UniProtKB/Swiss-Prot annotation, chain A:
Quaternary organization: Component of the 19S proteasome regulatory particle complex. The 26S proteasome consists of a 20S core particle (CP) and two 19S regulatory subunits (RP). The regulatory particle is made of a lid composed of 9 subunits including PSMD4, a base containing 6 ATPases and few additional components. Within the complex, PSMD4 interacts with subunit PSMD7 through their respective MPN domain. Interacts with TXNL1.
Complete-protein stretch covered: 157 to 310 of 310
Disulfide-linked positions: none
Protein name: 26S proteasome non-ATPase regulatory subunit 14
Residues modified as Phosphothreonine: 110
Function recorded in the entry: Component of the 26S proteasome, a multiprotein complex involved in the ATP-dependent degradation of ubiquitinated proteins. This complex plays a key role in the maintenance of protein homeostasis by removing misfolded or damaged proteins, which could impair cellular functions, and by removing proteins whose functions are no longer required. Therefore, the proteasome participates in numerous cellular processes, including cell cycle progression, apoptosis, or DNA damage repair.
Organism this protein belongs to: Homo sapiens
Tissue and organ distribution: Widely expressed. Highest levels in heart and skeletal muscle.
Swiss-Prot record, chain B:
Residues annotated as transmembrane: none
Record has Phosphoprotein as a keyword: yes
GO BP, sorted A to Z: proteasome-mediated ubiquitin-dependent protein catabolic process
One GO CC annotation: proteasome regulatory particle
Biological function: Component of the 26S proteasome, a multiprotein complex involved in the ATP-dependent degradation of ubiquitinated proteins. This complex plays a key role in the maintenance of protein homeostasis by removing misfolded or damaged proteins, which could impair cellular functions, and by removing proteins whose functions are no longer required. Therefore, the proteasome participates in numerous cellular processes, including cell cycle progression, apoptosis, or DNA damage repair.
Protein origin, superkingdom: Eukaryota
Swiss-Prot/TrEMBL keywords: Isopeptide bond, Phosphoprotein, Proteasome, Ubl conjugation
Subunit and interaction comment: Component of the 19S proteasome regulatory particle complex. The 26S proteasome consists of a 20S core particle (CP) and two 19S regulatory subunits (RP). The regulatory particle is made of a lid composed of 9 subunits including PSMD8, a base containing 6 ATPases and few additional components. Interacts with DDI2. Interacts with TASOR.
Leader peptide range in chain numbering: none
Cross-link (Glycyl lysine isopeptide (Lys-Gly) (interchain with G-Cter in SUMO2)): 32
Protein name: 26S proteasome non-ATPase regulatory subunit 8
UniProt similarity note: Belongs to the proteasome subunit S14 family.
Positions spanned in the full protein: 266 to 350 of 350
């Protein structure tokens, strides 16, 4: 948000330093970087910015962005997921099964080579297990398959 | 406890049986116990034959008790995979 305030040059005979409610200055020095901001603490002293929010506005922005990311009438996209679960999912299920064969026959080399090299030293090379993400996609498969009974019946 | 054992296992695939063999197995040649079985039970006393009726299940509506017990079970799968504390 970043706001500023200009200082004069006539009042450098006098001081510049009453700074009431000291917390604001020590808060100003933390959001902060540079050599040139450090060179522009002269001619500039900032000022704290804060935020007050209408609970009406907060709650209707919550309406918008926790309700309107769900879509209209709210059944519509979940029944569309139910449309996915019998026509499109089996193709990415084939992709999942091919990944969970091909990645697996080389990630069974991994505890072998853990026993081989050392007790757990530095990163040897490229690949990893990465199975957890593919399993989470399979969890998406099962949850939207659970959606089928709920939506389709009644 | 054998009388009601025959009166239990009668309802199976005895699709028709002649009466005097049931007289042999049950007991009591021409009794009023034949009235007891043929009336308290089904097995309609027709011509020389206890007749077998038919009953069905169709599994029609369920389709839904499958669907709601799967609602329970997959809410359970998602619930245990869900946990976090």
């Amino acid at each position: 948000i970043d706001a500023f305030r200009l200082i004069n040059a006539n009042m450098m005979v006098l001081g510049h330093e009453p700074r009431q409610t000291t917390s604001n200055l020590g808060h100003l020095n933390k959001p902060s970087i540079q050599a040139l901001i450090h060179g522009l603490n002269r001619h500039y002293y900032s000022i704290t910015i804060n935020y007050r929010k209408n609970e009406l506005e907060q709650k209707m922005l919550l309406n918008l962005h926790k309700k309107s990311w769900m879509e209209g009438l709210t059944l519509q996209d979940y029944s569309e997921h139910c449309k996915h679960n019998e026509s499109v999912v089996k193709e990415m299920l084939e992709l999942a099964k091919n990944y969970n064969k091909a990645v697996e026959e080389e990630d069974k080399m991994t505890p072998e080579q853990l026993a081989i090299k050392n007790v757990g030293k530095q990163d040897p090379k490229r690949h990893l297990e990465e199975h957890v993400d593919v399993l989470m996609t399979s969890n998406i498969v099962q949850c939207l398959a659970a959606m089928l009974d709920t939506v389709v019946f009644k | 406890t054998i009388r009601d054992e025959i009166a239990g296992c009668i309802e199976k695939a005895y699709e028709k049986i002649l009466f005097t063999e049931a007289t042999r197995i049950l007991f009591f040649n021409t009794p009023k116990k034949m009235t007891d079985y043929a009336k308290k039970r089904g097995w309609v006393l027709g011509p020389n034959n206890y007749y077998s009726f038919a009953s069905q299940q169709q599994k029609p509506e369920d389709t839904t008790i499958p669907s709601t017990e799967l609602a329970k079970q997959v809410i359970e799968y998602a619930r245990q995979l869900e946990m976090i504390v």
